[model samples]
Structures are given as structure tokens and as C-alpha cells.
Target: SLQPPPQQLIVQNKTIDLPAVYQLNGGEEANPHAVKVLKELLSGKQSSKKGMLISIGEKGDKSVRKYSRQIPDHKEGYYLSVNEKEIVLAGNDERGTYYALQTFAQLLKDGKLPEVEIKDYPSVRYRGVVEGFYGTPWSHQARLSQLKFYGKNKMNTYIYGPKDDPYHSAPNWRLPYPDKEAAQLQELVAVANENEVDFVWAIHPGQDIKWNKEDRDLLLAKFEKMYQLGVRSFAVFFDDISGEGTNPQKQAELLNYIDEKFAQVKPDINQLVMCPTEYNKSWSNPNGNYLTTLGDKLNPSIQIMWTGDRVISDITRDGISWINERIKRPAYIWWNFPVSDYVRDHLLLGPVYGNDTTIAKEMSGFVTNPMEHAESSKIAIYSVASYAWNPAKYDTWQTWKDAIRTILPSAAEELECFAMHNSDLGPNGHGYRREESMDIQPAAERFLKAFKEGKNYDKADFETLQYTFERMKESADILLMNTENKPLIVEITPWVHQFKLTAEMGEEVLKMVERNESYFLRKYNHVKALQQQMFYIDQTSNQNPYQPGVKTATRVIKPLIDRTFATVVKFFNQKFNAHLDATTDYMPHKMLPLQVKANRVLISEIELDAIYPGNIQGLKAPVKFVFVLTIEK
Candidate 1:
């Protein structure tokens, strides 16, 4: 299937076998870059005879303009027609021509071009990704690969705004990129140009700006330096800062300065974009008038970026309406998804949902904030491209399955089983969650009901439950054995290992419940040992400052393990008066309730500097500590 199915397509009851040596025409008036791309796409074979003529050019070209009426009237739009005798790849613009060729290449993958006509264009104006997470930025090689991927998928934008890049933000925002990095940026620009992608270089200067002429000139000088490196798109970020630099008026002034002087002076420069200090509804002060000030002062063409209702949130129509009114234009979205900077141990390999499909017009752009694991992040970004290009036709489950298959074609079912179990962001501070372990939930649920109710087992449900864990173990093994996609394996190795251990523990729990006699304690001990291994993986993997632990099957498998362990242990202790340990490593801390009868001091809150702080909240520690209290007589 076409990943981002074309906006309009009509397939006749006909098919044509592509010739081995097709004659190519219309290169004289065509986009030269696009023509070169096509030549490279078919470099291995084909192109000499007149058996089948392939015409490629923009809508303005004399040879292709005849089908102008069929082309969609939008930027980066294209009309492709394939027949028995001739084939046409016509675009509304140069980028569109390149995109048309990309589609043509996909069509030729079957060794034949179908007899069909497709009119295609992206739903959103700007569509791609932003390397805006706080942790390690993607490697230079990863970024180059990402650009090529974007071009193939018809995504047109790539924002270079890694939060930790010194020159991109704070301390060194005003300085030019070092020689080595500058050379890399130049090479990236060349690749981006070849792929018809906008290499948007963004400046993040709101951390400690002086708001003086010197600083303003420094910012412009930085832009000039990047311009020399062949960057034509630019943005300024004022997010994640607290200082006088957060002032809305000054931000608008600086943005307008860049708009009028730098972006306007360069005729080829695209419209400037800015991420405001108050970039989300949850962070914005309703009465502060910050967003309104930017709307009232900044240039209309200068696009404003928003992150939906909160810093990490789904894009909703209501959220878009609130920001669009304040920003006075369609918000350029900075969607934070599959970005696990906050939860570094987890891989968000799930379908892209929670976005309102009807609001494509409410935003000028949509770009995902992907995880630092560049190779693995493609799973989410692929669906983002599909959604951004054509939101109305986006199928969450179908797109997700397609992404898994496309990324790991040889072992898609293995990846699918692993992804299904690893979707949730277990106990996150943002209160965000995704549906995980959905396919086997019913089986697990039925098994849990029968066990808890002490009823006779349902054979199908029991086998289904057993098969689920068995497949999880098998899937992890297959993924680890895969050598084709080593980069992805490297990024997700820890979580994959943890997933396997959890599945093994789950299998043991089932064994403990299924049997009625001799080796209950032995199975229990093995499960405990597996728990220790899982904890070791959690403690050591992706060690970061926030939410530092590995978690998979959080919503179902681990909970099932914990419940089964406790229930079986309790039954044994009651039957034989045996003392057995039933605890697992999942949430190993609990605060005992305090007695408050006498006129004693009552502590309200507690804080700890432990690796996982959620385990220590509300604890009554016997130590000297700082406390704020409200007393009543």
C-alpha cells in the first residue's frame, strides 16, 4: 500500500509492465536536481529504447503543462499519470517534481508501474522533524540518513535545534559554529538541497540574553554565518528559560528585526519561525498577555510554534484554537512524541494517536520531537510523515504496523510483538499513557478473573495467556539475533533484555499458579531471581537524571506477575502456615500510615535525592529536615 495514500487516486482495470530500457524525455525544461535524482534512482538499469516514454518536469514545462488542469492547486502538489505507452511525473513546483519522482520510484518497486492517476499534496504546509530534545543529539551520520528518509517520504522540513548544542542555545548561542561543525553543516545543507528539504537552522538565545544592540547584532551575525553555510530556513527558540529574556515584547522585537533585516533581505529565505517562552497553554499565564503581545507586535508572516496544551501533549482542535487566537496565525506545532528524554530507558514504539485529524488547517506546520535514538525513532517519525502529509486518511494501527514492517522487514512480527508490550510510559510525571498489551488483554483478563474467583480454568484463555509470554520471549530473542538493523538493536538492547526477563518471570508465575504441589518454592525462587535481573537492567540502562529505570509491559505483564506471585504465596502461607516472600521489584517502597491522635507534630511532605524520587514522597523519616507547616490552635 502507498504509506501516505494519495489524496485522490483512480486505478483502472489495467496494468502495464515497465520496459527494461525506457526512453527518458523532458529533462531540458525539468528541475535539474529532480532530473539528477531520477537518474540516480534508476542508475542500475533501464533508459535507452523508445518502447515506453517517461516524461518528468514541473507543471510549467511545455511537455508536462498540458496536464496542468489535473494537478492539485497547492504548494508541493503533483499529478502523476501512468499509461501503457507514456508516463508523466508533473509537479506544481520543483519540490513537488522531486516528490513526484519519489512516488514514481515506489511504484516501480514491483518491477511494474500500475495504470493509475494520482493527485497528491501534503495536508500541512510544513511537515518533518525537530531534533529538539534535551539529551544527546542525533549523530551527524544519523541526521544525514534522516534527511534522505524525509526526502523519500516527501517530508520537506528538518529543524536543527538540539537543546544541548552550545551554539544552538545558551552560553554560546551568539558564537559561530566551530570549523569542523560548520563544514558538517555545509554538507548537510547540500544533502538537504538535493532532497528538496529545508535545513532550518534555529537559534536558542533566550537563556541569558542581555536584550541589547550587541546581543541583537550577535544573533544576526550568527544567522549570517549559517547563511554562508547554505541554510535558507531559520528559527529562534525562547522555550525552557526563566529570566528577563522571557519578556514577550523583547522576543517579538528581536524576531521582527531578523524578519525585516535578514530574512526579507534574502529573497530566497523562507519565512522565519519562533518558539515562544510560553509555547503551550499549560505553561501560559492567562492574564499575562504574553502570547497576545507577540501576536500584536510580531510580523504576521513570522510563524509561532506551540506544543499543544502542554510541553508534551497531543494536538487537539481546542488546543489549536486557543493558541491560534493568541498567536494570530496557525500555530507551527512542535509535537513531542516518541521523545524519551524524560523517560530515557523506554522506547515509545507505538502508533501515533491522540491527534485531532480535522485540524490540519489550524496549524501551519507539524514536526515531531523524536527520541535521541535516531534509528529507532524512525518508527514514530514515519507515521508522523504519513499523518502530516494526509491527516484525513491517517490510520493509527495500519500506519504503525506498516512502520514496523518497513523498518524491520525481515522480522516485522517479532518487532510487532515487542512493540505491543513496550508502548506505555509507565508512571510518568506528565500523567501521559498509551494503550499497551491490548491484543492479549482479554485473555489475561479472563485468566485473572478465573484464578481470583477460584473457578475452573478456561482452556483457551490459559493457553492464550501462556502463548502471549512465549511469543514475547521468542520475539525478544529474534530481535536480538537480527544483524540487519544493528543500530536499532543497539539503542533498544537494554529494554529488549528487560522485556525478555519480564516474560520469563511471567511464565514462572503461570507455572506457580498452574501446579498444585511439589516445587512451588523453586518456581518462586526462580521468578525472584529473574526479578533481580530485571532490576539490574533497570538500574544500569539509560541512566539519566529523570525517571531513570527500564519498564515494559507495565500495564499488564508486570502487574500480572506481581498479582499472581502475591496471590499464590498467600494461598500457600494460609494452607501450610508457611512463611514465604512474595514481593517483586516493581515499586518496592511503601509509606506506612502515621497515627495522629495526640498533640504531636505532623509532617506534610518529604523529599529525597534518591535515583527514583517517586519512591520516597510522603515518607516520615526520622531525621532533621526542612519543613513548611500551617498550624491551627
Candidate 2:
């Protein structure tokens, strides 16, 4: 099923290759990106593939409609039928038509389309990301690329509120975007429009905004400038900030003033969004005193953002409705699952989990607050798209696979190996540190999969495991070979190195016991070299600014490495009357275990070190035998 699950689907045995030429019936010159995407996927006449047909407007014809089985509402629904004879695609309007085309394109990219009847629409009214995290924000190119990604997936919103942006958070709520800043925003607006994603410009003036007419006029002037540049939605954030004299009623009036002014200018804006100071229960005291008055004063048209019970917990359906009743508005769930701003050391590569299925039906919006790193956030954003589109059918594990394939189609293996280790974040009311990924399943558990199957745990299985790690290493190698998507690549960099070394280390360790000879002595060199290199990489922060990029990966492979030496040590000693006396005397470490616990519990509060001692832990390791001997001498 398509994300957000199609309203209805009928499968057929027949299929056909995508045609070469496609034309947009009512496509405008202004919003031609969809057409560009169509040409990119189909290869159009540019490639050898040749064929053409179909109109995507109000009058797509009845015969095609008959083939479609039913024409859905043109606003957000679509009907599609693909056959060797012809292709019929219809949507309620431009948006629906293009969205229908997007579904067709995704299916075509995955496999050739079929002569099946399909009708689709969104389950959730609002879907997308809120770039509201701390740390370095994404580059202009990354944000632009993310808008394109939103279009490719089925999302339709993007709220801009990076923590470091001076204008967004500074008292200059009425000032112009700095010249350089305005240029980036201008291009960003064009990109968003080109992709049907809303460029929702949120100003975080809550810290110093006064409720006077002069300030209100200045705020509107800022929005008017954004509106002129093509931003269609606006948001006011009061999260993580305070105005000494500000109260609920006053803030509400300011928002109401803006909402009215926003409507006065042109076509009524879709909606205004607000994030309150007490965005979390952590601030939910004087409870009704604050929310009730704020709710009563705020306009019904404005959407409110609510995290779950805590700032980052499972969003229950009851919770949304309760908050909606409290605010008299369907609370737009600003999910903070994948955000790493709070943790700072870890990248949240986990699947979008914990929303009650019915939560989608009532929530005004389901916007994810992503990690400061854009490309890295997509790993989580991919499934958040699915959850926002169709929560009822958002298959956590399978959708995760789809998300992987969608983002790293050619190199999914490597990323999956790395992601499995890093994914599986739990309740963040503690910053995703309250639980561990049962899915990553202890590495102690992964190598044992075949063993537990009642299958042979012989050389065959060992080799298979070796191959798996080998393929993973190759994936990272391929990813490292990029240019434009470099910064994004950095998010996964240390992990790529860490995972490769891990697999490489595991392979050699496997051979050490299985083949049993001094031939593997040099293999330990690989481990030592990697340990040193990983230590240096995390210390240097070349691939990442936070240095915790590698720290993010220690949890993934540690259990296996942490315990495998012991596992291997147990087997090696008894099997051949061999003991790892020197190896045993060499130092043991908490490299893998320490970092995994970093994610399991609150992350390490430690700072950078001069020593390069990162399986990928920031901790130190016991000196190797040679080094230890040198000191003894």
C-alpha cells in the first residue's frame, strides 16, 4: 500500500513499462517542478524509452474514469489505471493530480506499474518536518533538497525555526531578513513552491516581543515580507523562551491580531501555528489557568502544537483529543522523536514510532521535529512520512526498510547495517534514552540468529555473517564517494567507518577461532589500527562538528564486540587447549558497552579528549601489550 495508505487499491496481473512522454494538462509555468520530476523518472524522450498519453485536469474523460473504477475528490484524492494500451491518471486538482503522479512514479521506480485501479488521499491533514532543533542548522542546499524529498514522499509542510537563527529567535521580529539570509529564504521559498511543500516561516519572538501596536505592526511587516517571497503559512513559537511580563491572554491577542492581519492581506492563509511556552507537561502547572485562558482567547483557525504527555513520549489519541478540548483546537502534534538537539551526542536514526493509530485522524498536524543534521534526519523522516500519510498501515519494520531504500537506494545494505545499530530510540521525555532498540537486538543476538534457528552454526553461517558485514562495509565505501550531498554524508561518516571496522573486526575474530592459527595475528592489527583511527576521527570532528558522530555508533556493534571477545575467548580456550594469555592480559574495554548505554541512558556529559580511544566510545582503552611492555621497561 502507498504511504498514508490509499483509500482503495485493486491489484491486477497485467503490467507495463512507463511511457516516455507525459504532459501536464493544466500545469503552470510557476510550479513546473512536478513535471521536471516526471521527466527525471520516466527518462521521457531523452532516453530510449518512448511512449505518451494522459491528461491530468478537471476533464480527464469518462472512459478513463471508467477504467479508474472511481474518480476521487480532486483536492487530495486521485484515481489511476496503468495498462499497456494507455495510462489514465486523475486528481481532484493540481495538487491531487501531481500527488497521484507521485504515487505512480514511486511505484514505477520500485517496479513497473500495473493495470490496477487505485484511489488515494491523505489520512492526516498536516504532514512534514519542523526544523526546530538546536546545534548547527542545515545548509541552504540541504533545506532545499529536503523540500524536494517532501514532495517525493507524500508530505506537504515544512516549518522553519532553526535554533541559531538570530532573526527567528532574536528580538528583531520586525526587522528584515539580513541580505544574505533573505537570499537563502528567497530561493528556499521557490524550492518549496516548486515542490508543493509549505514554507512555513516561524518567528520565535516570544523571548522579547512586546504586545504593543508598534511591535505587532513590525511582526506583520516581517510576515508580509515572507509572504511576498512565497511563504504561505506563519508560526509563532514560545517554546524554550520567556517574556517576563507576558501572559496567556496577551500572547493570544497578539496571535489573533496577526491571524486577522494575515487574512486581511490576500487569500486567507491556510492556518497560523503556535508553539506555547508550556509546550511540555514539564511546564504544565497552574495548568488550566494558562491553557484554558489561552485557548479561549486564541482564534479557532490557528493550529496549536502539542508534544505528547511529556515533550517526547508516545502521542496517544486520547491525549490529542484531550489537548484539543483544552485548547478548543485539534492540537497539531509536534513530534520530537528524532530530534537530537536535546541529546546532542546521538543521531536519532530510529523509525517513527509510538503514535496511536487513531491519533492521525484527529490531530490537526503531525510535524516531526528533526535532528539539526538534515540528510541524517531523513532516516527518521522517511518513516515519519509514512506515519503521517497513513498511521493505520504504517508498518514500522517494513516501512523502515522502505525508508532506507528510498533514501539510499543503491547503498541500503551499508546504511541498514549502520542504521540497525543506531536506530531504536525510546521515550525521550529523557531525550530518547529511556530504552534500547529491541530491534538492533544485541549483536550477541544477531550472530546467533542462524544458531537459534536450529540450523547449522558451522563455517557456512560464519561465512554468511562475514559476507553480511563485508557488504555493509562496501555500502559505506560507496556513500563516501559523493560531492553535493557531502554534509549529509558526514552525519553517517564515523558510523560508516565504525561499522566497517566492526564488520572487518568481527570477520577476523571469526576466522581466529574457526581457522585457528597465527595467520590471524595480523588481523588484530586491523582492530588496533581501526581503534586508533576511530579514536582520532571522533577526537578531530573532521566528518562531524559535534564529534559525537562516532559516539552515535558505539551502541550499535558494542554488544557483539563487547561480548564476542568473551564469546570467542570461551570457545578458543576450551577447543584447542589454547588460552589468550597475552590477549587476556592485554586490556579489556567498555568501548561498545559504554556508548550503547549512552543511548540507553542519558548520553555522556563528557567533553572532547586528546586521546583517540573511541569501538567508538569516548572512553579510554587498556594499553596494548607492546605499549604496556614499553612502560614496564
Candidate 3:
């Protein structure tokens, strides 16, 4: 697949034939790019009048289906088969078809057959890539190249925003007005339009946490301006707004205000995407009731963003299902994948973490936030994109195989094996926890051992598995190496020490389980009570102004003691159950002995100096203050 095919076809001069069922035409402002693509398509020697051309109006003509077949499983190129006529083209849109025509022309020039059949559509509807800033001319060129790539690869959408641009302040969520940044957006839109791709304009509404009336008005004005410039889609972001005390009522009011203003100004706002500030431990369902309220109050046509944790998952699927049922609104998933930081430097070798097909099926649109990391793991992006486009039609493994072939033709066989291993470790298969106690640890160890044994693997079927093992190790090492803020052994020493001490005490506590299960349980319960009291006291005291300067230090120290006690208690309860049906009075003498030993051990190690020393420095009177006090005296 990597090697170039036998011959290259180049289009020369030709006119497309109109089928009986289909007609071709263009808007008053005819697309020049489409025309150019058509010219290119006709440039090959195989250009023929047998190929039909179909034109779709703004609302898309219904009768075109009679002659045109919607073939979603096309490979070589996108096409419409109408009755006896075969309409060969590159893509769906006039521009897309124009490009397709060009490809057809290329094949024909190389003495390829003119009557090649193709039936294809994107697996995912929203195959998009986002570029954060729009300043450099290089970015514009890169976008153009990307658009061309997208057109070839069946990618349909592109989003542009300045995610980390500093000049733009919040409240007034407007892109900087200078020549360079503004012009880049216009250029990108033009490029997208040329490539027949939907350009989603993303704007951060809560840029500076200063959401005032003036700011809202300014943002609305900017949207209107962008709309006038042929940008219809918008992604409204409220990500940065800290969700402290944020409620549904407040969210509804703000949304209502925006909706009212938007309605008044522009009647043709096709897409309105909102990213609310409800991300937390319960990201899909924070304490705030804003999501439902906003959905209800805002225009029903708008799309709400759904993150994995927020909507559907093992822990909160029921809650998300209930919310979705209540809202009765179409949701868009903001899948954070193919991005380095989001995956925690883990390569999405398969659909393990967030690549849940069940979740994909529940949403209307799936937008991947694949940034720089995608350069290396582009296949991951393609796999997710394919599934997102049509979840019911494809499985993760099939999509992954197809993606590998498309992205890395030479390594398709090897990569497919790699993907298979990752799938096994994914959630739906055998979920692999990072802990060594898990059963997956042995499996991983075996795989790693196989990888270490081989230097070069054969291209044979058996070698495929060996290559897979080797590649998995390589990819996993790459993943681990890229992880940011990864803890070093030195940094983990304290935690390791604490765990060991806790385990040691816990073993001692387990001795009482056989004889005095009830008594040991009572003692464990008492210890838990004390631990909770200590936890609450430390938590509350940390906030106390007059509390000792080393209050934070005290908070850290208390957890170790609490964990040790809890571990010991748990051990006793677990071990006691294993041997309980014996004597009437099962109180073992070992309980007192173990308790004494554990207490002594804890007492010997518990040095108050560890907690109090750090605070003492901060509490010390300032030398300057002391000198001033002496002078005053």
C-alpha cells in the first residue's frame, strides 16, 4: 500500500454528463474552488461524459436520490450511483465532487479505467481539527494543507480559536482586532470553504471571569460581525468560570439574555454550542442544576457539550441517563483524545479509556480535541473520528484496522496487532488497573518478557504477535516518558514509608480476628471514630486564622496516622471472618499483645517535631518588627 500504484492518472479536458435523475448547478455566488476542482478533474485522459454530476441546493434537493445512491461504504472516492448512470466524484459537496473529479482525472490520465465505482461517506459527521491561534501566515498555509488533507480523508469540520492567547481579555470575549490575528481567521474560513468543510468559530465567553453586561454585548457584536463574514457556527465557552456557588437560575438568566440578543440580531444562527462551567468531581452532574435549566431556557436547536465523566460512565451512567431523558435534547460529546495531557501521556493504542462506543451512540455529535499529540498518534484520531461519525456501523477494532491502513499503510499489520493488545486492556475487555495486585500485571509481564526476547521479528503471522508485543512496549515507554509531573522515587518515599508502616500495624491487628472478632471490631470502630474526629478537626483547624502556623503541615501528618489505624481495623475485620466459627469465647490473647506492639511502634515514630518545625519559622516575629518594638520601648 505504501508503494505508489502502477500508473498515475492525470485529467486533461472533459465535460461531466448529467444523469436523467440528477442535475448540476451552483449558487449566484458560484464557488470558484469548486470550479477549479472541476477543471482539475477534467484534465485527465479518462474524463468521460458517462459520469453524472449532481448539484444540491441550500436545503438539498430530495429528487436527487432517485438517480443518486447514498453509499456510505466507499473506498477509492465518494460517488452517487443514479439508475444506470455512475456519478464519480471526490466528495459530497460541489467542491468535494470537484476534488473527486480531479482524482478521477488523475487515474484516467495514467490509462486507468474511467468506469471505476466508488461509494463512500465519512464514518463520523464532525471530523474536526482545532487550531488555537490565527496569527502567522504559516498557520494559514498549514490550515490550507490540513483542509486539503481533510478533504482527502473524509474529515468534514474545522474549529478555530485562541485557547491560550493572552492579549484577549475576558468579559469582552473578542479576538484581538489587529491586522494579523483577525486576518488569519478570515483566511482559515476561506480555506475551509474551499475544501467544503464546516468551520466552527469558537469564542471564549468567560475569558477573564469578568462576565459583565458590556462584555456580553461586546461578544454578541463580535459574533454578529463574524456571521456577516460567512461564519455561521459558534462554540461558546464557559470553561474557566470557577463553578463555586454557580446555580441553574443564574445560568438560565445569562443564556436567556444571550439567546434574546442573538435572536434579535441574527435569525440564521445555525449552530450554537455551549460549554458550561459544571466540571468537577461530578462533571456530568455538578451540584448546579444549570445544564438542564440552560437546555430548557435556550433554543432547543443548540448543542450542549458532554464530557465522558459528565454524561455517561460506570459511576454516573444512571444520573446522566436520567438527565438526558429529562432534557430531550441532542448532546455533543467533547471527547478529549489524541491529546497528550488529557490521556496522561498514555497512547490511545485502542479504545480503552474514553473510547466508549456506547457513549458515542448516545450523542448527536463527537468533537475530538486532538492537538499536537495527534501528530504521532494520528491513527487514534482517525479511529475515534470514524466511530464518532457512525457508531452503529463500526466497531472499535474494525475502525482501528481501517485507520492503520489509511495512516500507516506499511505498518498496518504490525499496528493492528498493537491495537488488539490495547483493546484487551480497555474497559469493555479486561480492564487493566495500574496496580501490580491486578491480574493484568501478569499478562503485561509476559508481554514485556516476549518483547525483551526479540530483536527482529519476522513478517509471518506468528511474528505479528511478537511484533505487537515489541511495539506495545515501545509505545508504552513513549507514553510514560511523555507524562508530565510524574512522581520520582524520591518524591514517593514518604507515601511508600507510610504505606509500609500501616501494613505492618495492620498485620499485627489481624491476629485478634480469630478469637475476639466482636471485641476487635469494637476496637476498630472506636479507632475509626477517633480518626474521623481527627480528620474533621484537622480540616476545620486548617481554616482557623489563629491556629498554629504549621496547620497545613499538621493536616498532612494526621492522614498517615488515620490510614494506619484504618488499615489495622480493616485487617482485623477481614482476617477474623476467615476463622470465626470455632470457640464460644473466641477472644485471642494475641489481640492485646499486637495492640501493645502497634501502639508502641506508632508512639515511637510519631514525632511532633515533623509537624511543628515548619510552622515555627513562619510564626517567628520579624527582625524588623522586633527592632521597631525596641526603639519604641
Candidate 4:
């Protein structure tokens, strides 16, 4: 009923609850997130916890051994069997034990769970989210929410190295997290541990750092501190910087030193995962290059990370295998999708695309970069996790549907309408730009086709199209009503409000033409007001919204609103005789042209008014005017 569905689930007629008593294996004590979920699940059913049993690393158990073959060779995998008397959650390793519990957790509905057999495993070993995007890093709370989200979705890893985190990038690398940041990380690490997810702390010191023995201490010390905070996996990125000292031998020496030392600190510490400056190349160097050099000299255990072809790409089997052969290790991918730092003009609310697991067998890791809007990014993160967990079975559209359900279960139907309209990915270097195929496109086409018949359109056709906008409006309203996340709501408020206004305008615009001049501009002002407000910014902004090009209002809501006006525009001309109307003049300037002259521009206009007493002056009243014209560059 929730979460990414299991890879294998055998439908069973029975549904059951907690046994009389329950207890988890000692190993599960470290997995607090799973424990909390199970407790809540039982409590909701009023099941006695006195004798419940939960096991991890189900080693040496005759029952679990029978399902051992179901476990994958690495990372986490589980075989869960539920009966009225017993519930078994078995993992290939401790990580699997944790993931298995999550599978069971998501299955819980109201208070009970399906008493079925589920065998689950992650297709990608190091499935995770890399906080490696530019702009504002996720809030500490947002990070915590993400880690919990990772675990709940069977995503087992999280890499922390946001570009804007002063500490993660270069100069501040030597310093420590502030008192507050340190404490927050402490909780994050603890939470990550409880959820059975690896917290991979990374540092990018390539901009300025010496790898010589004298400077080794500074590098090792930074990682040691993070190790103390419960981090076992670590990465040192050599990306987005100069290649000045990036000869493979010099970098390998530093990595080998850290790996050897860390393995000594915690024998079970995961070997280093690094990002080389030249991370991806389809053609290999026959004579050996940076990657080849690292492959030849670096310890086989230390993993090398790479981004496929382009940083943002469609994952393919051939590209990864090429990376793997050159690196002499399975490719550990740092996939960038739903990362909007580059555009800042759209929210990637679509399904995680390119869900191909063809290269999973040759992959070491799979992690996506989240957008600056953290909570908003989860819509895609949910599916990225689903793809990572079971690539072979991952379904993009269905996963997106499940994401909608998880995000707004209370208003899923209408919210889906909101999601579909906003999910359009545009021309911003993301793969499959305008790749989405929505039924609404044709619905709008159908409405227009019928509308072209002038006054002869069927009433059902008009109502059909009208309901589409109304449903979209209903969805946005449901989201706006949220008491929490008000700031988030406000940011997208103009976007959704336009949908409602569009729906309301359909009837108004239609009334005047076929319905005669009675089609007055009911929502005309609201639509115009919202269009201006959609570009709203706080007093904190000292410049025009897109001066250096920060965020522009998303293309999602406005264009949709713009499309609705054409039908009415033609209608208004013959009967209403109004050449200028909603969207005809204003919405075109929403975004200023990128290049322009620096000279002062004159402001000139002529106005005529069909005025109200308070709006006697044409300037204050809505213009009901004569010929209007303006110069264009």
C-alpha cells in the first residue's frame, strides 16, 4: 500500500498483526529507526511486545539459511516471511537486516500488514543521495529527514558534500564543524546508523592541499574526527578544481595512506571512495592515464567514483562497463538528476528517468544529487531510491504515482493533478527534456478542436476541459492548506493559485463569446495579480529577481495559464471588441531578456479610462482604453 513495492511479493489471502510478544536480535539494537517503526506498528495494533522476535545477520539459523540463496552478493538484501505466530526478517548482512525491516514498515497500513512472503534486495549496492549540489545546502533538519527517508525507502547510503557547505569545499576543509553543526552531524550520524544507512562524509581539498607526508596529518585528522562521529565511509573529491597536482601517483599515495590508517582505526571501515578530476571517458587510455594509473597503483579495496558520460546522463550499460574496465573496479556512480542548481527555473517533480539497471552488476554505487529545494526534491528522490533498490523491476511512472501517494496521501487525487502539470522537465540539460507525455496535452487539444467550431461546441466537451483545470486547482488548494511547510507553500503559492484562477476563468471567458458578452473577466485580475506575484521576492533581495540569475518563477504554472487565454482572446475580439486582455500584454515580460543596452530607457504611455470615482485617473484604474503601443529593442 506504500513505499516502493518489493521485488518479489507472493500474494497471500491472509493479513495479520503482531504476535503476542516480540524481540529483536541484539544486532538490531543499533537500528533505532527500524525499531521505532516496528514499535509503532505493534502499538497501533495493540499487539503485546513481550515476546516478539526480530533478528539480524540471521547467521547459523537453519530457517534463515534456507533463504540465504535469495540474498545478493553484496550490500543489503532480505527475505521476509510473515505468519500469525512468527515474523522473520532476514538479511544477507546487517545492512540487509535493517532494510528488511523497512520493507516490512512500509507494508503496514492502518495497523496490520499483509502476511505474505517478500524477498527483497537492492539492485545497486551503494544506493544513496549525494548532497553535492550547489547553492543552499539542505537544512540540518532536512538532512535528517532525508537520512530517515533513505532508510525507509531501502536506500542504504548518503554522501554529504554540498558545494555551499563552507566546510566541505577547500579552504574551510581544515576547520571543524561549528558547535551547532557538529551536534547536528552527531545526531545525523546516529540516525543514519539506526536506519542502517552508511553516512559517507566527504572533503574536497584539491583546490589547495599538499599530499606530502608533512601535510598528511591535516587530511587524516579531518577524516578521523568524522570517523569519531560514526562515519565509516569517506571520499576525497578532486573534481571542479585544477589538475595541478592530480597525477594519479600523488593522489593514490594520499588515498592509500588514509585507507590503511582508517582500516586500522575500525577494521570494518569501508575503503575510500574517490572522485578523480577526469572521472568519465568512453575511450580508455591504452598507455595508461590518471584513471589507469589509479587503477594500477591504488589499493584494490579503495573505490573510485565517476559520473557517467555527462554529469547528468541516461545511465547505460556500455558506459559503465567502460568505466569499470578502465578503473579496474566496478564503477561507483554519482548520478546527478533532479538537481536543479543549473536551471533554478524548474522543480524536477517528475519520475526519476533512465531507470535502467543493465549495469547494476558492474556498479559499485548509485546516488543522485538532490535539488536545492530539499523537501521538494523528495518527489524524485523517492523514485531514485525505488530504482536503486530494484532496478530490474523499477517503473518510473508507477514509482512517481507512489511518490505522489507518499507525499500527500490526504489529497493524492487532486495533488496528482498538481504534480502532473508541474512535472514537465524543460530544456535545461536534463535528459528527455520535454520527455513527459501527458494526457492533458491532448485534452487541451481536444477542447480547442471543439472550441474552433465557434458556438457549436458540445457542453460536455467544455465541461470535460473545465474539470481538468478545476481538478488541478483543487490539488493546489489542498497543498496550500498545509499548516506546516507554509514557506514552501508560499513559494509555490503563485504557481498553484494560477491553476485555480485558470479553472475559474474557463467559465468566465467562455460565457462572453458562445455564452454571449456575459463572458465577463471574472478571474482576470486575480490571474494578472498572481502572475506578478509569481515573480515575488523577499525584501532581502537587493536586485531585480534574475540579475545574476538566481531563481525565476518556474515555467510550470505561467505557461499553463498563458495557454488558456488564446481561446478567450479570439472570442473577445469579435464580440467584446477588446484587443488587449489578460496575458495579451503583460505575461510576456515575466523574464527580462538576458542581454540589453545599459542606457537609461524612457517610460512613455497614453491612457484612457472608463473610470470609477476612486479610479478617476486612468493611472489608478484598470485601463479600458484606446490605441496602445510600445517600442521593442
Model 1 score (lDDT): 0.84
Using lDDT as the measure, the top candidate is 1
lDDT of 4 by residue, 1-633 (tens): 545567788868898865545655544443445456656666634333456554445434444565577655554667777776567777766666667777787766656778777776777678878899887788887888888878788787888999878888878888778878888888998988877778889998888887566557877888878877777889988877875556678888888878777755676686468888776563234566778788888788887887777656767887787778777988788877777676554556667776456667888788888887787778788888888777777787888888877766666676567666665546554343534326655545565666665545556656665676567666767888975555456545544655565455444444433443433554455445544443332211212222222222124333433555666666666656777454522322212121211111112233322322211112333332322122221
Per-residue CA lDDT of model 2 for 1-633, tens digit only, reads 465457678878877766545443333321245456555665534332234564444335432444343666535667776766666666655566667778877667454677776777778888899999877888888998899889877788999998788778776666888888898898998888777788899988877777778777888888888887777889988888755424778778888888776754579476589998777565676436778877889988888888877867778866777677778877888888688765554556766667797666578888898887788888778788888777777787788777777677766765666676565442334654523335434433646654334344556545665666677677668778745457667766765666566666666666654543455456545555655655554544533333243543344354455455555555556666876532311122232122312222112222222223333322246332110111110
lDDT of 4: 0.65
* lDDT score, candidate 1, position 246: 96
User: Local distance difference test, per candidate?
Assistant: 0.84, 0.66, 0.43, 0.65
Deviation in Å, model 1, residue 591 alpha carbon: 11
Arranged by lDDT with the best first, the candidates are: 1, 2, 4, 3
Residue 600, candidate 4: C-alpha displacement in angstroms:
12
Q: After superposition, how far is residue 184 of candidate 2 from its true place, in Å?
A: 2.0
| Clash count, one per candidate | 0, 6, 23, 10
Q: Which model scores highest in TM-score?
A: 1
Residue 313 of candidate 4: its Cα lDDT?
73
